[PDB]
């Protein structure tokens, strides 16, 4: 399952100084996709991100490419070189009302009126298409303020007409809250697991997306997929990626969380989870750390704990064949799970999330340093070759330790008591190959 | 002995085709109608598989053989029978004019523009026709340039009536899901169990026969055993048999799931058990099936909980509480028979056993035919050769093998399928078939290959 060439799949190309509402295509491409000048289009990027734009022709734009500015790439969670999908969006209505909020670090200090100084001049007679979850930057006077679209009516996208009511009242959105959102886990955040991600897409995503395919040939797909492997191999990471990437409804069940609940409450929450997924099908239930709620019925010295395992088995069996629900699970102790849960029609398929090789280790090292300030002498392939037996969690800690050693090297220019860290200390900070070699030497 | 085989009776006929025939009409030969005292236009009751019924009008037919009954696809579909199957026919004189009927469309036949369902479809279909209909009937109607499938949801009188001019036809409500009816159509019957001919006979003689004909046992002066335990290794079709019995039996059927009872609160587990036996008693003749008995009734030694011992005591009291006039038979299943409390296996409790074991080559072929009947097979697929290469496999292993062959066939087309597409390419869909190569691949992928060693 690799990405297929389709006429509406295009490579993200730059458009410096371009308006936030505009994407550019070549004329022959627009002709092919039956797209006309001014048409409203729907763009799809990574981690289920969407953007609504106006399409314009461009003779400097290659057929296979789409030009878009930084703000739009940021909304689609894509980089230059990435592939997006484009489709016509004819059903977009004039907005009745929209609610936007400023990002807190762009509104620090003197303000004036956000609507009058920023939003009114930005939207004025422009008829901008916008989507809930859009981030956009506006210049007003001598200042820049970043806004988030929090709600639209109609939802989740509309055109901001002259009659659209623009709301900007409320407590500003925290930069840190949106940073966590921007850097939510995607499939690109999982390294050294290419074959496993393919197994998961074919056993989980494919039957939920295309149940016609399986009915056609006359096969019922397996409904229980167990990910197994040693600690820190990225089982929970994969759960998070699936959560953020899937077209289906996703309900996470945390083993320890259910087991922390009162007697009766543990079983109740389990029932509530399966009910919610059924109602919202197609759906994925992920039961993380399955061994916590479902150990061998021998290794249980409590009535409630045996009761909980019975509850899960009944819920698995209770998933009638028309429910369009797939249950995923993860464990670092697969031999410790009750054998009854691994029977036909339950968790009958398995995915080994194991120890990565040298190439996989390099993938993980690239992922965890992508937002890290690296010096030019840093050779990550050489780091990859020196970390045999390491899993993804060991490699994350190694990168962290190199970084902390880099900070430790400047504690003779840093005073803890200071209100502010010295600017040159801040701007010069980089992790060296020496910091990595030190981290490699410090060890498990 | 598998001696309970289907007997030749005058009203038992072989299902034969009637292309272009009306949904309300069945055809018999004249001598057959004479024999059964059936006249032209008489209303008849047809009985098929899985307790399915159909009410039709009978007409004579000189092209129809004496031993056969002609019926169209819609009627066969309602009786859950194929060409070649046997059905029973009987006069149905007590059928009254309906006061009201409620029908609902199937959702994939009503996608898009509609008009008026009653006016365009149902009124012209029923108009002056005096059609007999039964609750649970599925029928197709042509109206304008379109076809819409309907389900009879309720009749008054229930469960069948004649749709007269004065019968009120209701078609309001949310359309019935095709998937939901597909689940119903393919509910488990005895034909869905392969490699268990002798065991199905044991079950019919120990369960069905005493519930159906308690006079037979009273006459000879014998009390039939009331506790039947099915045992055998994982995936041999014990739960499958429970489902088949549930759908085939003339008795009331109450399922008790072991794990389900054990998932309940203290006190609630025992309460549900009492409720199950009470419900079956009230609705006798009845079958109680306790699936996975070992879950609720392990050896009173292997219990480190007061409630779990309490639950076993509860079951024993309920078994003993079944007085000899209750006309209730308790079936159970387990893959751990040695792990059940010995007290439950005493006289007058679970004192009879049925070994649901490992099938032989011929049994395996039966299972392979059942699980591929709704599967698109290429012509090179030799299921007998598959049967001969799956020694040590049980029914569950054969189901997984068939699934894996099909999934491999889909996997072979992932270079023509994009995950992100809204629709799968039509020619990819229409050409999809499972090959003998897909099966050979599946046979090589294995706890098949690792399983042929085991049972020699
Ligand atoms: N394949 C991977 N690619 C990139 N980072 C990884 C990978 N595996 C682990 N990591 C990093 O290590 C962290 C911890 O990994 P988790 O996914 O929580 O481990 P896990 O496999 O769920 O371990 P258990 O069994 O819960 S102790 C992740 O948040 C990642 O930052
Ligand atoms: N004798 C059989 N004939 C046809 N299909 C079978 C047979 N046995 C098993 N199967 C298939 O395998 C599936 C699982 O069988 P079950 O009846 O659930 O197994 P079981 O004997 O109840 O296993 P345990 O003991 O609960 S683990 C069924 O739904 C069928 O699809
Ligand atoms: Mg984890
Ligand atoms: Mg079973």
From Swiss-Prot, chain B:
Q: Which UniProt keywords apply?
A: Acetylation, Amyotrophic lateral sclerosis, ATP-binding, Autophagy, Charcot-Marie-Tooth disease, Cytoplasm, Disease variant, DNA damage, DNA repair, Endoplasmic reticulum, Hydrolase, Isopeptide bond, Lipid-binding, Methylation, Neurodegeneration, Neuropathy, Nucleotide-binding, Nucleus, Phosphoprotein, Transport, Ubl conjugation, Ubl conjugation pathway
Q: Quote the record's binding site residues for ATP 1.
A: 234-240, 335, 371
- Reactions this protein catalyses: ATP + H2O = ADP + phosphate + H(+)
* Effect annotated for changing residue 97 to A: Abolishes interaction with NPLOC4
Looking at the record's lineage, which domain of life comes first? Eukaryota
Q: Where is this cross-link: Glycyl lysine isopeptide (Lys-Gly) (interchain with G-Cter in SUMO2)?
A: 5
Result after altering residue 305 to A: Does not affect methylation by VCPKMT
Class of this enzyme: hydrolase
Principal place of residence: cytoplasm
Q: Which GO terms describe its cellular component?
A: ATPase complex; azurophil granule lumen; ciliary basal body; cytoplasm; cytoplasmic stress granule; cytosol; Derlin-1 retrotranslocation complex; endoplasmic reticulum
Positions carrying N6,N6,N6-trimethyllysine: 302
Q: State any single GO MF term.
A: MHC class I protein binding
EC number, UniProt record: 3.6.4.6
Q: What is known of its domains?
A: The PIM (PUB-interaction motif) motif mediates interaction with the PUB domain of RNF31.
Q: What disease is linked with this protein in Swiss-Prot or TrEMBL? A: Inclusion body myopathy with early-onset Paget disease with or without frontotemporal dementia 1: An autosomal dominant disease characterized by disabling muscle weakness clinically resembling to limb girdle muscular dystrophy, osteolytic bone lesions consistent with Paget disease, and premature frontotemporal dementia. Clinical features show incomplete penetrance.
Which protein is depicted?
A: Transitional endoplasmic reticulum ATPase
Native organism taxonomy: Eukaryota, Metazoa, Chordata, Craniata, Vertebrata
This chain is encoded by the gene named VCP
């Amino acid at each position: 399952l690799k990405q297929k060439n389709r006429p509406n799949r295009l490579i993200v190309d730059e458009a410096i100084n371009e308006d936030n509402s505009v994407v550019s295509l070549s004329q022959p491409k627009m002709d092919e996709l039956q797209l006309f000048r001014g048409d409203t289009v729907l763009l799809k990027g990574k981690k289920r991100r969407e953007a609504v734009c106006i399409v314009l022709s461009d003779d400097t734009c290659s057929d296979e490419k789409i030009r878009m500015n930084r703000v739009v790439r940021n909304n689609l969670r894509v980089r230059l070189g990435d592939v997006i999908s484009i489709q016509p969006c004819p059903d977009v209505k004039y907005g009745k009302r929209i609610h936007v909020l400023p990002i807190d670090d762009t509104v620090e200090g003197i303000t004036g009126n956000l609507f009058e100084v920023y939003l009114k001049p930005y939207f004025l007679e422009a008829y901008r298409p916008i989507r809930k979850g859009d981030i956009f930057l506006v210049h007003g006077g001598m200042r820049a303020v970043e806004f988030k679209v929090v709600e639209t009516d109609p939802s989740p996208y509309c055109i901001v007409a002259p009659d659209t009511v623009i709301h900007c009242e409320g407590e500003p959105i925290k930069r840190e809250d949106e940073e966590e959102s921007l850097n939510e886990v995607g499939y690109d955040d999982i390294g050294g697991c290419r074959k496993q991600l393919a197994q998961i897409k074919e056993m989980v995503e494919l039957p939920l997306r295309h149940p016609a395919l399986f009915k056609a040939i006359g096969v019922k797909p397996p409904r229980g997929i167990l990910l197994y492997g040693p600690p820190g191999t990225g089982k929970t990471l994969i759960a998070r990626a699936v959560a953020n990437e899937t077209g289906a409804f996703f309900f996470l069940i945390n083993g320890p969380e259910i087991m922390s609940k009162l007697a009766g409450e543990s079983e109740s929450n389990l029932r509530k989870a399966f009910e919610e997924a059924e109602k919202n099908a197609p759906a994925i239930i992920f039961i993380d750390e399955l061994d916590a709620i479902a150990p061998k019925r021998e290794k249980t010295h409590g009535e409630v704990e045996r009761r909980i395992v019975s509850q899960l088995l009944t819920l698995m069996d209770g998933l009638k064949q028309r429910a369009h629900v797939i249950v995923m699970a993860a464990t670092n102790r697969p031999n410790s799970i009750d054998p009854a849960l691994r029977r036909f029609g339950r968790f009958d398929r398995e995915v080994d999330i194991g120890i990565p090789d040298a190439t996989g280790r390099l993938e993980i090292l690239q992922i965890h340093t992508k937002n890290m300030k690296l010096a030019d002498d840093v050779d990550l392939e050489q780091v990859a070759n020196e970390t045999h037996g390491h899993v993804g969690a060991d490699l994350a800690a190694l990168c962290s330790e190199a970084a902390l050693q880099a900070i430790r090297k400047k504690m003779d220019l840093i005073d803890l008591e200071d209100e502010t860290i010295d600017a040159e200390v801040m701007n010069s900070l980089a992790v060296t190959m020496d910091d990595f070699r030190w981290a490699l030497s410090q060890s498990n």
